[PDB]
Amino acid sequence: DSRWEFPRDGLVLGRVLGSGAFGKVVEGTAYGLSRSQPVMKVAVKMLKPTARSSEKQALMSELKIMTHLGPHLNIVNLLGACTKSGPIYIITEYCFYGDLVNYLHKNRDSFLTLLDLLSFTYQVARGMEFLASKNCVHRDLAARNVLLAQGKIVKICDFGLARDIMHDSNYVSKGSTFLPVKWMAPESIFDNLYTTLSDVWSYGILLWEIFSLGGTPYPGMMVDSTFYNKIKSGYRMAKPDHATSEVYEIMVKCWNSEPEKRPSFYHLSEIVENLLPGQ
Numbered sequence: 001d002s003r004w005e006f007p008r009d010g011l012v013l014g015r016v017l018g019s020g021a022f023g024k025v026v027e028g029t030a031y032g033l034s035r036s037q038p039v040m041k042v043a044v045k046m047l048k049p050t051a052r053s054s055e056k057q058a059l060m061s062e063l064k065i066m067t068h069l070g071p072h073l074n075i076v077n078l079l080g081a082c083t084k085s086g087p088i089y090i091i092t093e094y095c096f097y098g099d100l101v102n103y104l105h106k107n108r109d110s111f112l113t114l115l116d117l118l119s120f121t122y123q124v125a126r127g128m129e130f131l132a133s134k135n136c137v138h139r140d141l142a143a144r145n146v147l148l149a150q151g152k153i154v155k156i157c158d159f160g161l162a163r164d165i166m167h168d169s170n171y172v173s174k175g176s177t178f179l180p181v182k183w184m185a186p187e188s189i190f191d192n193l194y195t196t197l198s199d200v201w202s203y204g205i206l207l208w209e210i211f212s213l214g215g216t217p218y219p220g221m222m223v224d225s226t227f228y229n230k231i232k233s234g235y236r237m238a239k240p241d242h243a244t245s246e247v248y249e250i251m252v253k254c255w256n257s258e259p260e261k262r263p264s265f266y267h268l269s270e271i272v273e274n275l276l277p278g279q
């Protein structure tokens with residue numbers, strides 16, 4: 001679709017927001033991208049000189065997925081792309097608060113309120129519901145892949161090539177790659193099965209991050225055969241400090257050993273809605 005093409009001369013590139021071995025996301029300003037706001041801040045994803053054909057394909061593939069998914073309030077939204085006479089650029093909206101983990105850390109003292117945490121929980125479920133409805137499996141759902149926009153609107157994202165998986169402790173080496181094992185369903189780690197149901201397990205881990213104000217899952221527990229054995233044995237985390245007992249129950253239901261026993265994202269949205277004063 002060429003409806004998304006944006007002239008390169010209308011895009012000003014700024015500071016780096018995220019970077020990996022082969023890709024990066026940078027801050028930007030787009031002129032004429034919008035009739036309403038002719039001077040608009042944006043985020044731009046692009047390859048680095050170090051990248052090869054395999055990565056170029058991946059970026060193009062990512063853009064296709066993005067063009068194909070429709071827009072949703074809770075997914076970072078595509079605004080345009082630069083695909084001619086140059087390296088590909090994917091342009092999205094800019095999220096004022098940045099990633100959720102850093103935001104939560106910055107706000108421990110203010111704690112931002114518990115209702116805010118519940119809203120985040122509700123919004124993520126709605127975004128995931130949207131992705132699931134499109135038969136799209138995320139595979140890396142975590143607070144580090146949740147952005148927060150103005151008005152405290154969560155925006156689910158996937159850094160992808162823009163994440164240094166090799167130097168990030170959250171990702172563990174496996175079969176010539178690194179995986180966020182502490183966030184993955186057992187059937188994913190051990191049986192290479194990825195489904196909307198395995199995303200639900202990650203969502204549970206995400207809720208633990210939210211209600212620990214950005215703590216590390218399985219704190220002090222390194223990833224090894226013992227950790228793997230504990231997970232397979234049905235071991236689950238304790239309740240984080242700021243979680244209520246209903247929020248903890250939700251996490252536990254997301255961590256069921258049997259994927260079919262996990263609630264749907266649509267169901268999760270309704271259960272969380274029942275915890276909110278607002279109807």
Ligand SMILES: Cc1ccc(NC(=O)c2ccc(CN3CCN(C)CC3)cc2)cc1Nc1nccc(-c2cccnc2)n1
Nearest residue numbers: 017025043044045076090092094095098137138139157158
């Ligand atoms: C600029 C850009 C380009 C592409 C994307 N793409 C995605 O966020 C994304 C989300 C979901 C999918 C779906 N996909 C399904 C298949 N599985 C395996 C992967 C996920 C794909 C891409 C985001 C962005 N935006 C982005 N990315 C990282 C950080 C920021 C950012 C950072 C700070 C402040 N404001 C914005 N902004």
